[PDB]
Amino acid sequence: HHHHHHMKTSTIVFGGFFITDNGERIQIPILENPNIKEINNFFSVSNFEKKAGVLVFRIIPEPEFGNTELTIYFEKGYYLPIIQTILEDGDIEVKNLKTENYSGNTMEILGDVYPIEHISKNISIIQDIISEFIMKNKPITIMI
Amino acid sequence: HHHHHHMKTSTIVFGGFFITDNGERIQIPILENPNIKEINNFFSVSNFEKKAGVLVFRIIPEPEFGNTELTIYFEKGYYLPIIQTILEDGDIEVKNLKTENYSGNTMEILGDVYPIEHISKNISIIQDIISEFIMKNKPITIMI
């Protein structure tokens, strides 16, 4: 079973959706190859801390190795970032916020229960995670 | 690290995008809790065999065990379905079309190279895979 990934023809695609208080799922307009300004603009105009939903930054088509997706679940100013990545041996792994020790404290995000060490309330940190993910995974060989 | 999934508050979300010949990525309107009629309608009005892109059926928020996503990459009548699932031991695994033997023959879909045993040209089979995925993973306790 032989998958060969071609970076040059792949892209990062940003999307996701908001969930309203009455349960509507509202699509976030798709952005191919998002840049930092565009993502800054999105956080600036969404009044994010009152909203809920999921953000997705996905590499399409999926690479054979390395990061495949950054997912951020969010609800009313609580943010849960998750990176999926493929290790050198092919195993699929999930990365969360770095955690020294688990307290046992939890909270609910989008109805599911997560350890609080995996959740941040700091939008700046979330934007930095997104920027790092774009810098790491954006296929941009073009010099202009 | 304690994730507890709640099925009742989760949903299947359908979306994705088309890729045009000149490289535009056009979002597919999001559908929460898609039913078979809606998906039949989508294949009926998309003239699918000339188009390219990616379909996604994702369970949000992701469960702790079982299927998490059905992704279908497609290009000009060639379809590549992939299911991601979480096994009882927590390992993340990918499922493709059942394959007895690999020939070594490949083709390109969306720029990446895949074994032909993982690709179908039969839209009916793809629709059946989607129906099975919805029947397996749709959280619908309501009897009416």
Side-chain angles (χ1 to χ4, degrees), chain A residues 3 5-7 9-48 51-87 89-97 99-139 143, chain B residues 3 5-7 9-48 51-87 89-97 99-139 143:
Chain A
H3 174 217
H5 182 65
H6 286 282
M7 277 202 70
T9 42
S10 77
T11 187
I12 295 171
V13 181
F14 167 63
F17 55 87
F18 293 108
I19 301 160
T20 69
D21 290 339
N22 286 317
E24 304 273 1
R25 270 80 164 164
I26 301 177
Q27 204 165 19
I28 293 167
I30 181 174
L31 185 54
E32 62 201 276
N33 184 30
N35 56 57
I36 317 287
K37 199 209 83 143
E38 292 171 322
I39 294 313
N40 281 356
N41 285 344
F42 168 88
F43 284 106
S44 289
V45 305
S46 297
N47 299 24
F48 212 64
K51 297 199 164 199
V54 64
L55 306 184
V56 175
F57 298 78
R58 184 168 183 169
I59 291 89
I60 298 292
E62 184 185 84
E64 194 183 3
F65 296 109
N67 293 172
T68 63
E69 182 178 331
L70 165 66
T71 303
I72 299 156
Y73 296 162
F74 59 102
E75 190 179 348
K76 306 284 170 293
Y78 294 87
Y79 315 121
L80 200 187
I82 313 159
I83 290 173
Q84 183 188 283
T85 192
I86 305 177
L87 302 182
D89 59 12
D91 274 356
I92 300 155
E93 298 291 329
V94 158
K95 310 198 294 178
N96 289 276
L97 293 183
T99 299
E100 307 76 8
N101 309 277
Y102 288 91
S103 64
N105 287 353
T106 59
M107 71 178 299
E108 264 189 50
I109 304 281
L110 301 188
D112 276 15
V113 179
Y114 304 93
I116 59 171
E117 294 82 4
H118 289 175
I119 295 160
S120 175
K121 300 191 67 167
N122 191 308
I123 192 60
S124 297
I125 284 327
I126 295 303
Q127 294 171 90
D128 286 349
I129 289 165
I130 293 166
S131 296
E132 287 282 319
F133 186 84
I134 290 170
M135 289 168 60
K136 178 76 187 180
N137 295 292
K138 165 177 296 209
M143 306 282 286
Chain B
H3 174 217
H5 182 65
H6 286 282
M7 277 202 70
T9 42
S10 77
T11 187
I12 295 171
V13 181
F14 167 63
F17 55 87
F18 293 108
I19 301 160
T20 69
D21 290 339
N22 286 317
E24 304 273 1
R25 270 80 164 164
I26 301 177
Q27 204 165 19
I28 293 167
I30 181 174
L31 185 54
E32 62 201 276
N33 184 30
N35 56 57
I36 317 287
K37 199 209 83 143
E38 292 171 322
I39 294 313
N40 281 356
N41 285 344
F42 168 88
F43 284 106
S44 289
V45 305
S46 297
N47 299 24
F48 212 64
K51 297 199 164 199
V54 64
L55 306 184
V56 175
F57 298 78
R58 184 168 183 169
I59 291 89
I60 298 292
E62 184 185 84
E64 194 183 3
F65 296 109
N67 293 172
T68 63
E69 182 178 331
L70 165 66
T71 303
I72 299 156
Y73 296 162
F74 59 102
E75 190 179 348
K76 306 284 170 293
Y78 294 87
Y79 315 121
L80 200 187
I82 313 159
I83 290 173
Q84 183 188 283
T85 192
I86 305 177
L87 302 182
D89 59 12
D91 274 356
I92 300 155
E93 298 291 329
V94 158
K95 310 198 294 178
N96 289 276
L97 293 183
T99 299
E100 307 76 8
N101 309 277
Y102 288 91
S103 64
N105 287 353
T106 59
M107 71 178 299
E108 264 189 50
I109 304 281
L110 301 188
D112 276 15
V113 179
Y114 304 93
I116 59 171
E117 294 82 4
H118 289 175
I119 295 160
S120 175
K121 300 191 67 167
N122 191 308
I123 192 60
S124 297
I125 284 327
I126 295 303
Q127 294 171 90
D128 286 349
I129 289 165
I130 293 166
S131 296
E132 287 282 319
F133 186 84
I134 290 170
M135 289 168 60
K136 178 76 187 180
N137 295 292
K138 165 177 296 209
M143 306 282 286

